[PDB]
Amino acid sequence: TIRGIPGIKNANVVKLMRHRVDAQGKLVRLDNIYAIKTNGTNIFGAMLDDNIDPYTIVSSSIGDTMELYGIEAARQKIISEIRTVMGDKGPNHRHLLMYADLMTRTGQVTSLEKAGLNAREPSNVLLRMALSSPVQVLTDAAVDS
């Protein structure tokens, strides 16, 4: 690496649409705000750089948010990612809350795959048997008593 934050493939200036509070207390919505949007997530390098606000770093990757920030920030990032994937006519927010709270209930982001079901409900042999590969999980339950 010669220059720039590693893992930042690109960086483009995008105007943002943001709310601010005036001295009279009005909640004015500002469109003149400028910030950059990158490709590739390296939150750590962004915090290191001084031209970039370290406390207002937003990353599309759940993993980097989990590692850098924690599990509550990872849960909020899961909600945000599922929401932006949903589109315009998305579901209610409580369903996304349920999705995110299920994965992040163990202090780690657990998937919806069979690995995540093992992590969240290891003792529920019958549930994992119903999900996939009943013979393998049946063998594991038998040997594990």
């Binding site: 370290p54 770093i57 850098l68």
Partner: protein
């Protein structure tokens, strides 16, 4: 430039932990050259419990993060110092966490010294004011009695609550030991902020 950020935010973290310093604060230059030559910058903190907490900011590629003999020597000789030594903290580079032998010496000295708690953290935990990050909601540690009252009202054993690792950055800044409870005020698009209580489990290796 993680050295300067780490240098300022470790002292901000000591202040956040409501601890006082036992010595005088050197500037950036002395800190970085001492880290580069010695291999570690040692910072002593005293808590309200009248315990002593020591922090070791290891170098990125120094002599101490590569060989287990020297690291073992440091732990053995520093842990026999007659301070109260409530907690020891090692701040090391990110790739060091995968290096096994350092984790082995850490766990070996943890088992050898029961009452002392040793944790090794990467750089990115102390390169920013973690409680001041927008994306991180407000964590606070509820005492054992109020957590027990909450559980008894809820008919919940502690293992029923959602778990949070003791290595979580907000919990690390708060100073959450495993087995304790942390109350969180998370913003909500539905109910306009809500409170959850999470159980602190054992940290990552």
């Amino acid at each position: 430039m993680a050295m300067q950020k780490l240098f300022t935010y470790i002292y901000e973290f000591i202040e956040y932990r409501k601890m006082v310093l036992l010595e005088e604060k050197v500037p950036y230059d002395k800190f970085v050259q001492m880290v580069l030559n010695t291999g570690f910058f040692r910072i002593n903190a005293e808590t309200l419990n009248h315990g002593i907490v020591s922090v070791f900011i290891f170098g990125a590629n120094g002599k101490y993060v590569h060989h287990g003999g020297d690291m073992r020597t440091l732990l053995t000789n520093t842990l026999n110092e007659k301070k109260h030594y409530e907690e020891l903290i090692l701040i090391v580079d990110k790739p060091v966490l995968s290096k096994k032998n350092i984790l082995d010496i850490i766990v070996e000295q943890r088992a050898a010294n029961p009452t002392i708690v040793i944790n090794i953290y990467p750089y990115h935990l102390f390169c920013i004011n973690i409680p001041k990050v927008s994306a991180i909601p407000k964590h606070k540690l509820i005492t054992q009695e109020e957590a027990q009252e909450f559980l008894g009202r809820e008919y919940l054993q502690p293992q029923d609550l959602m778990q949070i690792s003791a290595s979580d950055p907000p919990v690390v800044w708060l100073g959450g030991r495993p087995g304790d409870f942390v109350q969180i005020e998370r913003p909500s698009e539905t109910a306009m902020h809500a409170v959850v209580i999470r159980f602190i489990t054992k940290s990552k290796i």
